[PDB]
């Protein structure tokens, strides 16, 4: 399998651009950024709202947990490559501790409003607007030959008063190389696409479009974990109970995917449930025919069938956000 767009980005580019294992970090001074208050936790890091002793300007301090230096250089190179793009968190500095040798990345500051309290107040228009903004971010990184691989509400900081948005945490992101076989243990369980669950290793940028699709579904239907599985095998069962099992067979047969006996039996056979059956008094104010058409074109088992970030931005559903942006 090969991406349908931006497939040759790293083929035309000098190895310097994507060879991150050869990156030589030019650390700065941890003696220049002060911690103010923890704002986020994580399996690979801790986030802190900090201040820049110099400019006096606020900032975000990310302290990385202990991991192989390969994963640290990867996140750094990608952030350097993406700096400047629309709605991409901007990396400002890189520092480390002298004794512990603990790495720390310095980022622009963004208030960030907890999604479990924000999303419920979003209006029909707000949703169209913020998703459109996230798509600018994804089309940009895909155009630069990079997959984020961890798209979820937690990695999208939103300053709802300034209506500003940023895609964050590029700790699992990777460079896309046609035909390469990547690790399927990326992203958070609820946003993992079928390809990661059936073990299709040569996946591409379309993986991020499935994750986005799960996010979108969660918002219009007012049901955060839209696909709520307790483990990976259970995650695929949940997906198959909504999209139907016939579509999964086509997918499996097309890419000649095995699918072990346990997960297969575990999945069984299910008919497809039309999107409208998920509508209820709590979410009918957000479920329009256009929203349904858009979501439908995102959540497709076959990664090659999904809309690209660029096609998504032009969908009629964002019709007013575009006109407002134009003038």
UniProtKB/Swiss-Prot annotation:
Quaternary organization: Tetramer of two alpha and two beta chains (possible).
Biological function: Casein kinases are operationally defined by their preferential utilization of acidic proteins such as caseins as substrates. The alpha chain contains the catalytic site.
TM stretches of this protein: none
PANTHER family per the UniProt record, alphabetical: CASEIN KINASE II SUBUNIT ALPHA
Name of the protein: Casein kinase II subunit alpha
Keyword annotations from UniProtKB, A to Z: ATP-binding, Kinase, Nucleotide-binding, Serine/threonine-protein kinase, Transferase
Domain Protein kinase, chain residue ranges per copy: 33-318
Domain of life where this protein originates: Eukaryota
Assigned GO CC terms: cytosol; nucleus; protein kinase CK2 complex
Name of the top EC class for this enzyme: transferase
Catalytic-site annotation from UniProt: 150 (proton acceptor)
Protein family membership: Belongs to the protein kinase superfamily. Ser/Thr protein kinase family. CK2 subfamily.
Matches recorded under SMART domains: S_TKc (SM00220)
EC number from the UniProt entry: 2.7.11.1
GO MF annotation terms: ATP binding; protein serine kinase activity; protein serine/threonine kinase activity
GO annotation terms (biological process): DNA damage response; regulation of cell cycle
Gene symbol of the encoding locus: ACK2
A Pfam entry, by short name: Pkinase
Binding residues for ATP: 39-47, 62
Swiss-Prot/TrEMBL catalytic activity: L-seryl-[protein] + ATP = O-phospho-L-seryl-[protein] + ADP + H(+); L-threonyl-[protein] + ATP = O-phospho-L-threonyl-[protein] + ADP + H(+)
